[PDB]
Design a protein around this ligand. Structure first.
Ligand SMILES: CCCCCCCCCCCCCCCC(=O)O
Ligand SMILES: CCCCCCCCCCCCCCCC(=O)O
Lengths: 255, 61, 239, 281, 239, 61, 60, 281, 61, 125
């Protein structure tokens, strides 16, 4: 052969990401996403399937990894609400269903060290900083801008409890690995690819109310390097919807 | 219409004892707990890979 | 008609019983099943997944932070220096107590099987080193020198392109099952880690780096005697 | 096969150990790359010379069924023997499983859970002190009435509601074996959802969390007997047993204590107990 | 003889039980069956029959009279004017609350199926008009203009020799069953009616006329979880 | 002379469980409620016509 | 249903009885048997072994 | 065959006596050498002229099963009806079989013993004297909870522990047949060991004796009812019956009285009772 | 699936009466005590020799 | 294939050494060690062979390589005299026979240089 297993090319729609350092690709729970069958249909109206127009790699915002930084999370599908025709279809349709290819990108030279956990947590319900309080929307998501974790227990009013070590939901962070995960350990690979299929208890759902899963990026070993060897290393999260289909068409709105 | 099935029994030095069960109700909900069924499949959790990994070969090559 | 007598054990509610009982809604129509990816059907499937151990655990300060998980290695350390040590006894030893495997274990009073600790080196990509991973069976106390450790079951991990080497700790026990609870009668020996050579680095690079340790249950493992956990309690009903 | 057919079983046993010998090969079975998200499949025979062992151990108390199917106390409710003027002559409980700590923690290990349930209820009575506490009284019957969502609600111990023309009720006399019913699956979804991350209103507002989905009606409890010349207090302890369970998506166990039964709020706790040093015998 | 033990659930009367029990008159001679036209054997047969909706419902005055049933149309009304609107949610919405379908529904906590609203024009025989019948799914509030309504599922009824056009409202729901009781989690969207053109009349004819709206359950419909109604009560035994 | 019949059970992902019933009394009145029988016929109420009406054709023509 | 009457001797615990009774741990996995030399299965096997008599017995 | 299959049996009968006649042979069937450690196989026909006899006697009450399988009292425990302020409102017992003299002596005749067990428990209540001892009270339910090794322990009559989400419990109302459970085999060895000669610590120290191996959890007992206007004392008598027994290595019966239930300590006693003379009629 | 077996009965002057047993539980532990089985073998205790000793011959010769 | 010839795993007894950089393995004079035959026996008594208990990797002391240092030697089997059950068997027996796997370990980063000869001299007087 002439193949290496460190090079991979994922082409989806009119968008191709290449990577020359990676370690395999994790297919969430062994199952590849696919369209709803006629044995699991509930809706009677004919679905639209926009295929190529709504499946393609949407590059979301990229935050800078620093030595002191504690971690970041984004909530899907909520994050994609301003991304092109995905956003539009989601805005004009009551019900939506789709899987997603999450591809986290980062890189560094040989004289850097540091290791990030990349994990897709389905159904992450989160606490509240004030334990008599109740969290509200704006502290759960900022859309496509990353929500930061904190390493200080105290937080504002309607703050979400986000002390790193309890993952913001009252479970020891070290056990998060039970959900589909990879690690970008700088020295080996430099990207993660998790193909997350649709997991929900009901066949399709409303894209605004429900948040299917949260992408958490937590640095377990801090970024470090010796003096004068670059100081800016961003982390870019690129995500592509797969097999997106929508039922129930009506006027645009939230309420 | 009785059903016959084998009871849990340990190993022995180098067998089968049956019991009888009959359902008396019209709804499957009323049936006894299904405590015998030991099937499992770690696969989905322990190796959720796309490309098969052979144990004896290096992981990255 | 048909006669018929009661026996001891009539009219008593037993928690672990199993009998048929009348339905409360005759002919209820259950909602049809669908798929749903990812189905457990046996807790051991969970126990076989790798959790990360918080070995570093010396003081409250680091225990309420991310520090807990990262074991500090340093360059220019004499060969045959102990990196860390703790006695193996999951579900009663603080190190593995609250990991995935540990949590599952604490619902049972008897365990059996083999454990596999995967050591991953998360240092620089230009740094090198070799470590001796030792597991001493019990009945002679923990090793005190590299030589003592050497006599026990050990793997010499040479760090390189492959980041992680797994120490498979085999089951060697008199009895078919040990207690989950700490007991003097059954002990599981001591797992220690030592510098086989030293960590060497090039010119401009950080001197200190970190390793991390994964723990999971091997493919032959089992648990018996189901019981309540001690990690949760209340003093009144939640509201 | 079917998990409501309980006489159909299966059998499997724990894997054996095959004998191995010394090697000096070019294959490494204990080197792997954690980064992949792949758990190593090393077995003892790969790094030791092992003998041949036969295991007849069988995983059999770690099946989901066997694990969950034991009757847990979910709540107890108290009510006196009274008149219509009393507001403790009957009582009610909004059905939920989040009140107790123990059972809650067990259930929350799975995101989606589908099961049938056996409800058993132990009602115990006690004589209240009074001047006339040596009054004679005959045996007391108790009525447990299930009111499904959006049905009539009792406003007193005695009103039309208690007629129960289509509401399931149990009349249980004291000094008999505890009352027991089986309930089928009852969701409008395809599984009970122990976690819901989402809002009740499409404008991203209202109620956050699991509360939004749960809605299961209420149990109203009363005494059937007319009052005696002194009050008798009764306390009903409700037991639930999940049978025929199927579970999807495992979650990490809870670490922090619960605070509320309507949300997942917590205050951060230490990861694990401190030990003396990094080297410890 | 034969021994034998009791289990929990002995000597307790359950309302929904089903057991055999001795007769009170041995060998009673039942009166022989005859025919009798019209036999129901399933409540859905009733639910499929068309009841008339009281849409007009603005005040007590018209609600205690025949006025309630007739929706007033008028000539020379600008196109794109809303005739009426209400959110769909049978058995908790006042409009369909006490109709045949509604009454059946209020004995159940779960419904599923498709509903069909038959609009009949009871105007003059020389008058003409076209109406847009819209059904908007939920998640964006009720439409506020003809344009908003147009984007939703709609039928344009042209009145003519055939008096009535039926708007079949299809089932589009996440879940297999909705609650009969009003609940924020499940909503069924908004049904609105609009003037597509206008009502035109000839010379000597009345300017105002009326339409009436029938409602029934389609051929796929079902109900679960039997429960008591809230539309009847007493404070003492009748005499 | 026992009778065997199938219990109510829901659908499954892409079966039959029996129960046994025996009558112990001499009068048919004493028998259990007949809760299984789902036959129906809307016809008598929904279309009580003399002349058949075809759905696709105009009602009056 | 099926009727059925009690007889004298109902609800009484007899020491030497022998009836079936529900288990307290469903599906417990018993530890597999091994050998162990020397197995009695009948007390007479013991009685047939020679003990030594203390015939001399005249004083404390 | 299998000792858990109780319908499978076997049959054997006691040996017959065959007729013999006078001899003047060169063979001695009644001379032997004790030193060998061999028990003589002499039968009556070897030293008398016997007639032919047929025996239909069968050893059938000296089978190990029949010998051990009768329900013995192992312990009784006492507890009053109280509040949380009382420290006698509940009680507990650490499971052991060494408390009673009789059953202990029977078991100790075999070194290794393997069996399943039927546990029956007779709870009896009595009215305590008080000023208000003619107070009326309804029937009392009792709860017996098994706590396996290393589980939560009650600190009061009323705390979370009693929820019993995976601990086996029996709720038994008074005036019913005694509560009964069957327990499988439960050791971590291959048989229960009635004697262990050895130490808990490899340095030849700590605990000497059987104590080291025994560890079986505890039974916590309480009243479920709220207190009446006077205390009621209850005493639970625990009965054990070993069924499906298999026994290995017979030992001499005990001679000296027991003193402790954690060790085999004794003080020396006379070999056998004195008799008048070496020749006695 | 019933099992039939013979009851203990004494000898008679110069027979067989059966009883029926059915198990009702899923665990072999719940079964009745095995009181019928009269097999024995004194051999292990009464003669634990290496060389066979013939009764009629002198023990040491 | 997926193999590389730079990774090697030697497992002997309950001891495994892995190495991810090596160049082959030199089998001394082409011959792999094995037990004495019955054509070359001289002793009449039955040999003991402790197998797994006495075959396994004994890590001896490690010296530091410095710029000025001149070299080191160890003498076998003499060196192994305190190593576990090998030592004991050697102490209680007049005659012994065994072959040996010598594995020298060292490592450095890319910015170091230096080259050591590793040689096994039989009968070095
Ligand atoms: C007297 C009749 C009583 C009928 C009682 C009906 C009780 C319904 C019980 C619903 C149990 C729901 C379990 C939810 C589990 C979860 O998601 O946490
Ligand atoms: C309410 C549930 C009660 C469950 C009780 C479990 C009791 C375990 C009994 C163990 C008996 C051990 C016999 C040991 C015999 C011995 O070696 O002396």
């Amino acid at each position: 052969c002439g193949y290496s297993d460190r090079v991979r090319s994922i082409t989806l729609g009119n968008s191709t990401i290449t990577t020359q350092e990676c370690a395999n690709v994790v297919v969430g729970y062994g199952e590849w996403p696919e369209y709803l069958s006629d044995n699991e249909a509930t809706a009677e109206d004919q679905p639209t399937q926009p295929d190529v127009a709504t499946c393609r790699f949407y590059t979301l915002d990229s935050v800078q990894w620093e030595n002191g930084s504690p971690g970041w999370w984004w909530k899907f599908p909520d994050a994609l609400r301003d991304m092109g025709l995905f956003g539009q279809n989601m805005y004009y349709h009551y019900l939506g269903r789709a899987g997603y290819t999450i591809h986290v990108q980062c890189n560094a030279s040989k004289f850097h060290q540091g290791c990030i956990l990349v994990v897709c947590v389905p159904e992450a319900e989160m606490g509240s900083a004030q334990t008599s309080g109740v969290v509200n929307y704006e502290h759960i998501s900022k859309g496509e801008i990353a929500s930061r974790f904190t390493t200080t227990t105290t937080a504002e009013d309607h703050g979400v409890q986000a002390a790193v070590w309890n993952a913001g939901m009252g479970v020891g962070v070290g056990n998060l690995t039970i959900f589909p995960h990879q690690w970008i350990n700088l020295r080996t690979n430099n990207s993660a690819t998790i193909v997350m299929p649709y997991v929900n208890s009901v066949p399709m759902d409303n894209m605004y109310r429900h948040h299917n899963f949260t992408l958490m990026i937590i640095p377990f070993v801090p970024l470090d390097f010796s003096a004068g060897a670059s100081t800016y290393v961003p982390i870019t999260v690129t995500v592509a919807p797969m097999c997106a289909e929508y039922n129930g068409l009506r006027l645009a709105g939230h309420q | 219409g009785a059903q016959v099935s084998t009871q849990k029994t340990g190993a022995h030095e180098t067998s089968i004892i049956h019991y009888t069960n009959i359902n008396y109700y019209k709804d499957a909900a009323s049936n006894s707990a299904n405590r015998q069924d030991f099937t499992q499949d770690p696969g989905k959790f322990t190796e959720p890979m796309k490309d098969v990994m052979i144990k004896t070969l290096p992981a990255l090559n | 008609g048909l006669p018929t007598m009661n026996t001891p054990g009539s009219n008593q509610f037993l928690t672990s019983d199993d009998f048929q009982s009348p339905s409360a809604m005759p002919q209820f129509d259950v909602t049809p099943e669908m798929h749903i990816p990812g189905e457990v059907r046996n807790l051991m499937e969970i126990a076989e997944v790798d959790s990360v151990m918080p070995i570093n655990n010396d003081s409250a300060a680091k225990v309420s932070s991310m520090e807990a998980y990262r074991v500090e290695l340093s360059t220019n350390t004499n060969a045959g220096t102990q990196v860390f040590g703790f006695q193996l006894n999951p579900g009663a030893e603080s190190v593995m107590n609250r990991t995935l495997m540990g949590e599952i274990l604490n619902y049972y009073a008897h365990w059996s099987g083999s454990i596999k600790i995967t050591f991953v080196f998360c240092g620089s990509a230009m740094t090198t080193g070799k470590f001796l991973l030792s597991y001493a069976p019990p009945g002679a106390g923990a090793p005190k020198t590299r030589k003592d450790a050497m006599l026990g079951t050990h793997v010499v991990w040479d760090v390189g392109l492959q980041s992680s080497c797994v120490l498979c700790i085999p089951w060697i026990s008199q009895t078919h099952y040990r207690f989950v609870e700490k007991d003097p009668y059954t002990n599981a020996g001591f797992v220690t880690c030592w510098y086989q050579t030293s960590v060497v680095s090039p010119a401009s690079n950080q001197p200190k780096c970190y390793m991390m340790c994964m723990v999971s249950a091997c493919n032959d493992f089992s648990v018996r005697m189901l019981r309540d956990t001690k990690f949760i309690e209340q003093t009144s009903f939640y509201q | 096969g079917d998990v409501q057919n309980a006489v159909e079983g299966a059998m499997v046993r724990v894997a054996d150990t095959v004998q191995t010998s010394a090697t000096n090969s070019e294959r490494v079975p204990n080197l792997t790359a954690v980064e992949t998200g792949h758990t190593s499949q090393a077995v003892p025979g790969d790094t030791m010379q092992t003998r041949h062992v036969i295991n007849n151990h069988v995983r059999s108390e770690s099946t989901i069924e066997n694990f969950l199917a034991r009757s847990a106390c979910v709540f107890y409710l108290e009510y006196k023997t009274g008149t219509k003027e009393d507001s403790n002559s009957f009582n009610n409980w909004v059905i939920t499983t989040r009140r107790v700590a123990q059972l809650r923690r067990k259930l929350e290990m799975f995101t989606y859970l589908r099961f049938d349930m056996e409800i058993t209820v132990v009602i115990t009575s006690s004589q209240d002190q009074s001047t006339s506490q040596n009054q004679n009284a005959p045996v007391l019957t108790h009525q447990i009435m299930y009111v499904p969502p959006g049905g009539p609600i009792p406003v007193s111990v005695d009103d039309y509601s208690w007629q129960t023309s289509t509401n399931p009720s149990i009349f249980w006399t004291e000094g008999n074996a505890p009352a027991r019913m089986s309930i089928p699956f009852i969701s409008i979804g395809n599984a009970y959802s122990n976690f819901y991350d989402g809002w009740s209103h499409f404008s991203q507002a209202g109620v956050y969390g699991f509360t939004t989905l749960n809605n299961m009606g209420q149990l109203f409890f009363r005494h059937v007997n007319k009052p005696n010349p002194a009050a008798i207090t009764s306390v009903a302890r409700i037991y639930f047993k999940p049978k025929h369970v199927r579970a999807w998506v495992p979650r990490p166990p809870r670490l922090c204590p619960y605070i509320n039964s309507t949300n997942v709020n917590f205050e951060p706790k230490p990861v694990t107990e401190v030990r003396t040093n990094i080297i410890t015998t």
